[PDB]
Amino acid sequence: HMIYAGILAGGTPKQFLELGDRPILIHTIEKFVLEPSIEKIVVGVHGDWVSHAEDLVDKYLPLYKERIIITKGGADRNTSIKNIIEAIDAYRPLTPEDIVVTHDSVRPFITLRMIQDNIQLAQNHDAVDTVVEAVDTIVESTNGQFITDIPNRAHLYQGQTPQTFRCKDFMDLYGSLSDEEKEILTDACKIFVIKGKDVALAKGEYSNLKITTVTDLKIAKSMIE
Amino acid sequence: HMIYAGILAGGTGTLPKQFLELGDRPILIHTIEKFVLEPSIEKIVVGVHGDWVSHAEDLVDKYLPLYKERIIITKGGADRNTSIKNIIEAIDAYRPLTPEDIVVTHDSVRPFITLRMIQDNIQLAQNHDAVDTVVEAVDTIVESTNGQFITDIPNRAHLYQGQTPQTFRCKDFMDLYGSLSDEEKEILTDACKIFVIKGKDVALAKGEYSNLKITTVTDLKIAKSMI
Ligand SMILES: Nc1ccn([C@H]2O[C@H](COP(=O)(O)OP(=O)(O)O)[C@@H](O)[C@@H]2O)c(=O)n1
Ligand SMILES: Nc1ccn([C@H]2O[C@H](COP(=O)(O)OP(=O)(O)O)[C@@H](O)[C@@H]2O)c(=O)n1
Ligand SMILES: [Ca+2]
Numbered sequence: 204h205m206i207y208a209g210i211l212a213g214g215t216p217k218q219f220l221e222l223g224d225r226p227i228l229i230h231t232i233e234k235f236v237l238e239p240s241i242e243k244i245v246v247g248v249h250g251d252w253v254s255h256a257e258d259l260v261d262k263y264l265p266l267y268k269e270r271i272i273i274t275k276g277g278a279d280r281n282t283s284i285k286n287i288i289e290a291i292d293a294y295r296p297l298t299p300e301d302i303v304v305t306h307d308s309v310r311p312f313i314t315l316r317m318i319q320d321n322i323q324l325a326q327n328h329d330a331v332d333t334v335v336e337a338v339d340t341i342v343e344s345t346n347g348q349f350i351t352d353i354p355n356r357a358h359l360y361q362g363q364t365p366q367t368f369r370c371k372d373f374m375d376l377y378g379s380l381s382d383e384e385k386e387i388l389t390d391a392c393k394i395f396v397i398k399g400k401d402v403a404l405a406k407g408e409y410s411n412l413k414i415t416t417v418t419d420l421k422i423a424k425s426m427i428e
Numbered sequence: 429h430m431i432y433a434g435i436l437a438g439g440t441g442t443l444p445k446q447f448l449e450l451g452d453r454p455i456l457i458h459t460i461e462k463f464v465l466e467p468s469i470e471k472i473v474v475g476v477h478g479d480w481v482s483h484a485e486d487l488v489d490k491y492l493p494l495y496k497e498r499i500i501i502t503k504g505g506a507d508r509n510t511s512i513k514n515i516i517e518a519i520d521a522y523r524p525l526t527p528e529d530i531v532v533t534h535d536s537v538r539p540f541i542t543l544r545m546i547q548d549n550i551q552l553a554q555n556h557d558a559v560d561t562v563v564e565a566v567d568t569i570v571e572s573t574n575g576q577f578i579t580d581i582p583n584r585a586h587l588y589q590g591q592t593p594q595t596f597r598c599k600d601f602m603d604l605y606g607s608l609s610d611e612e613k614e615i616l617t618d619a620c621k622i623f624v625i626k627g628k629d630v631a632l633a634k635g636e637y638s639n640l641k642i643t644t645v646t647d648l649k650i651a652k653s654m655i
Pocket of ligand 1: 210211212213214215216218247276277278279280281282283306307308309310389415
């Protein structure tokens with residue numbers, strides 16, 4: 204079986220911002236290029252930014268242009284995955300056993316260690332979520348007016364990426380959902396859980412920051428001196 | 429009836445940052461300054477560690493000279509609940525508690541609280557049991573009861589990050605903290621968690637993503653850039 208990388212960069216964007224010296228997207232793709240087991244690295248880019256992602260690849264990673272496929276992502280992260288898996292299928296026809304390690308372009312501090320656990324866990328599980336023990340106190344409210352519930356904070360995890368699973372599996376489970384369900388089931392791991400599937404946990408790092416806000420940008424800058 | 433600010437501002441065992449310089453003033457000072465903005469808050473009761481009581485007194489004498497008779501320094505407890513107990517009992521020494529007297533509890537290490545947040549807490553406390561300043565979770569929260577594979581990914585749209593202010597009536601909190609045993613108090617160290625699990629109507633207050641909790645070093649670095 205093959206292993207692929209699925210970089211999600213189709214968002215609406217922070218990943219084309221310079222971090223230190225190079226775009227966050229380039230930082231993120233970098234960690235995947237060394238990994239011997241990863242066949243191609245496939246990036247879902249917003250259809251408008253595709254060409255600008257390739258100029259970026261040429262300018263910043265000319266040694267790996269062959270290892271990278273830049274493809275049009277979709278309206279929401281799940282769709283981007285669909286599109287990434289489709290592009291994988293265009294490179295080599297998917298077998299039941301081929302794998303995708305998906306990851307946010309805006310997470311530029313993922314470690315080869317994480318990547319390797321995800322790949323490694325996926326052997327004897329349906330899918331793999333990368334998480335860390337929750338820091339904030341989490342409060343629930345179905346209405347958004349008063350507290351409907353407070354979950355037990357000793358079993359809560361802050362969810363990050365990689366999210367790793369077989370390709371066919373995603374195309375099957377995601378495929379079988381009405382639009383209304385897709386709109387509610389936005390997390391890729393959620394879909395596996397509700398379909399009653401075994402999703403194991405990969406140890407993430409509190410440092411696996413996801414860069415969404417101008418505050419996240421500062422935290423990142425201080426992490427690279 | 430009365431309105432008090434209860435500033436949870438002391439303890440060890442966890443190096444907590446409330447006495448560090450932010451811009452020019454210690455963080456705690458920034459925090460107290462927000463509550464002096466509110467004309468309606470009677471006194472501002474600050475709950476510091478035993479060793480730090482006088483250090484805090486001086487900080488008021490040095491940085492808040494005029495609003496010094498507005499502020500009352502007191503000893504904290506082992507946990508913030510024991511501290512709220514101590515803040516409450518300090519107020520009862522100042523002015524005997526009237527069943528409706530509310531306390532606006534707040535982390536001393538959250539100096540970016542606005543008056544808007546404060547006023548929403550006094551207001552929402554009117555016809556609710558308690559108030560919890562809150563913001564929409566930005567992170568997907570994942571539940572796992574076993575610890576190796578997931579048992580639940582709640583809907584994120586319905587999930588919230590806890591902040592402070594947390595507001596309530598003084599007698600109301602004491603009467604619940606009482607019925608709890610010494611081993612019972614351990615399992616639920618947050619104040620709003622007591623109200624909910626003893627079935628009470630505690631409403632949400634729109635918080636702020638800028639309402640940072642200064643705990644780590646990078647947190648201090650973010651904070652310094654914000655002011
Ligand atoms: N259609 C989409 C939407 C978002 N994304 C984004 O997914 C990652 C970050 O997720 P997000 O915070 O935008 O959304 P979510 O919180 O993961 O649902 C980014 O690396 C990427 O920009 C994507 O690749 N394709
Ligand atoms: N007995 C205690 C213990 C800690 N605290 C802490 O509660 C406030 C915010 O919490 P923190 O940032 O120290 O973090 P933690 O809640 O102690 O994990 C601090 O101002 C103070 O150090 C308290 O008010 N009373
Ligand atoms: Ca009443």
